[PDB]
């Protein structure tokens, strides 16, 4: 049903909050790259999907805790969205 819509909203919330909190945790650490919000949002997407481009990573303790929260909630919610799309697709498979 509209559970996928609620999972999508949770995923977006996780991505935005992870971007904001990642920038907040990483600024102040020399060499840190997760320090501007757009690419922190990109990194949140990469984390939720586990796509593994490896172009951005947190180097502080709190940045890595933020990363863990984005992994748990982001991977779970993105898994819910993906499951919903798959079920809808096989639902389309009965047509032909």
């Amino acid at each position, epitope marked *: 049903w509209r559970c996928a819509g609620a999972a999508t909203v949770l995923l977006v919330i996780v991505l935005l909050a992870g971007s904001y909190l990642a920038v*907040l945790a990483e*600024r102040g650490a*020399p060499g840190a790259q997760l*320090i*501007t919000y757009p690419r922190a949002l990109w990194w949140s997407v990469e984390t939720a999907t586990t796509v593994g481009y490896g172009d951005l990573a947190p180097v502080t303790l709190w940045g890595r805790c933020v990363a863990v929260v984005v992994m748990v909630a982001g991977i779970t919610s993105f898994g819910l969205v993906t499951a919903a799309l798959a079920t809808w697709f096989v639902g389309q498979c009965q047509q032909q």
Partner: antibody, heavy 118, light 108 residues
């Protein structure tokens, strides 16, 4: 409208302290960072530190001695830099700048000329 | 910390010709470089962001180029109002750092 407003000058006795202000106008976001830059006469720009007013965390340049403390008032939309125990090496123009969390300083204040003397 | 080297420190040109400012980073920083102009007694003013993106209110004579470690600020046809110091600035890694600046002077 001048988006960032700073006092023109402050005179500080040696070993004393001063509190510089930077009143912000225009668009305000929680992604906003306020930075402070020091410029000695005939010299270049020197990054001092940053603060995110919508949370209150500040970071400081570690390559120089920490003679500053950053605060912010969300009501008056005003950032403050406290310079403590000043020598004559601290006499300079002090700018504040607004960065929308995307890495560049879109707007700058006019700067506060700080003179340390008796 | 990223060291931004601006060489030469002084640039002397005749009016109307094209001038290029050099900024070189001690390591690769993608396109996370930004350029500022500071006239005598004035505040710095943003000219170019992210190496090449124009800024509203900045004359089209200004452009930027580069990626990795080598970046260039270009003025297509210099006029007297371009006389100032020019600073580059990186946002790729904490902390943000500035170059030491290049002075533009005009031979008239």
């Amino acid at each position: 409208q001048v988006q960032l407003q700073q006092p023109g000058a402050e005179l500080v006795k040696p070993g004393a302290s001063v509190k510089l202000s930077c009143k912000a106008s225009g668009y305000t976001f929680t992604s906003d960072w306020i930075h402070w830059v020091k410029q000695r006469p005939g010299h270049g720009l020197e990054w001092i530190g940053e603060i995110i007013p919508s949370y209150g965390r500040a970071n400081y340049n570690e390559k120089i001695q920490k003679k500053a403390t950053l605060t912010a008032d969300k009501s008056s939309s005003t950032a403050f830099m406290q310079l403590s125990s000043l020598t004559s090496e601290d006499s300079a123009v002090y700018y504040c700048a607004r960065e929308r969390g995307d890495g560049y300083f879109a707007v700058w204040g006019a700067g506060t000329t700080v003179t340390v003397s008796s | 910390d990223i060291l931004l080297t601006q060489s030469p420190a002084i640039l002397s040109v005749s009016p109307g010709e094209r001038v290029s400012f050099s900024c070189r980073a001690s390591q690769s920083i993608g396109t996370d470089i930004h350029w500022y102009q500071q006239r005598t007694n004035g505040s710095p003013r943003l000219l170019i962001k992210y190496a090449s993106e124009s800024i509203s209110g900045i004359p089209s004579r200004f452009s930027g180029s580069g990626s990795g470690t080598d970046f260039t600020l270009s003025i297509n046809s210099v006029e007297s109002e371009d006389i100032a110091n020019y600073y580059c600035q990186q946002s790729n890694r904490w902390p943000f750092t500035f170059g030491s600046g290049t002075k533009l002077e005009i031979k008239r």
